[PDB]
Amino acid sequence: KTCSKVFLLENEISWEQVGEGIQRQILGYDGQLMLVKVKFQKGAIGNAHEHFHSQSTYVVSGVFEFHVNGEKKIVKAGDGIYMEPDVLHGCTCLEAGILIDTFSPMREDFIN
Amino acid sequence: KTCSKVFLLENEISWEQVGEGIQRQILGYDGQLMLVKVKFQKGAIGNAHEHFHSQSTYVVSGVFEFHVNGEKKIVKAGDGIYMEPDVLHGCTCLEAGILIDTFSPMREDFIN
Ligand SMILES: [Ca+2]
Ligand SMILES: [Ca+2]
Ligand SMILES: [Ca+2]
């Protein structure tokens, strides 16, 4: 049965170390939709990558420089970013904060 | 061509009035994934509803009482909620704050 629990409580879920200055919690998901909370320290880099999944991100807090398909924009709390299937994208955290990354379908690699 | 722009800047997107004390911005989406930012005043109610879409929500801020399939839980900033296809769910805002609701596939009704 491939899905998260119903209530994903931050203080009950393990933070996974993703890289230097980057930690994440996988929150609500099934095979078609996955929501990930990613906490960045200043200076941390989301390495450029491509994947077939659709991705839609929300900036909860902090300030980030994002690039999507070669285009750069600084985004801040309240802003969103859409990454169509297979587009190159990544980010650098300018001030510590949280992103919510969402995916369709799920990122099987994030649980396996 | 069914999708949002790449960079969804809060100060460039219209807030839509959804109901009493509830406003939303549709952020990054395509036909398979849609991310919605929903700002609630204290007291506001997300009416109980059912839909075939998968939904995964993140509590950005505030405090909410959620019900999913008849089960109630208070959630707060950092917590998530997963709503499998067709489950009855809704919420009441106990302290003003923001939810990110994500859907697969998109909520066609939110743009049409
Ligand atoms: Ca799908
Ligand atoms: Ca990505
Ligand atoms: Ca719903």
From TrEMBL, chains A, B:
Amino-acid positions noted as binding Zn(2+) 2 in the UniProt annotation, renumbered to this chain: 49, 51, 55, 89
Sequence positions that bind Ca(2+) 2: 49, 51, 55, 89
Limits of the Cupin type-2 domain: 38-92
Domain of life (superkingdom): Bacteria
Keyword Zinc applies: yes
InterPro entries: Bacilysin_H2HPP_isomerase, Cupin_2, KdgF, RmlC-like_jellyroll, RmlC_Cupin_sf
Stored Pfam families: Cupin_2
Alphabetized UniProt keyword annotations: Calcium, Metal-binding, Zinc
Transmembrane parts of this sequence: none
Binding site for Zn(2+) 1: 32
Binding site residues for Ca(2+) 1: 32
GO molecular function, one term: metal ion binding
Presence of the UniProt keyword Calcium in the record: yes
Record protein name field: Cupin
Organism: Bacteroides eggerthii
Lineage per the UniProt record: Bacteria, Pseudomonadati, Bacteroidota, Bacteroidia, Bacteroidales
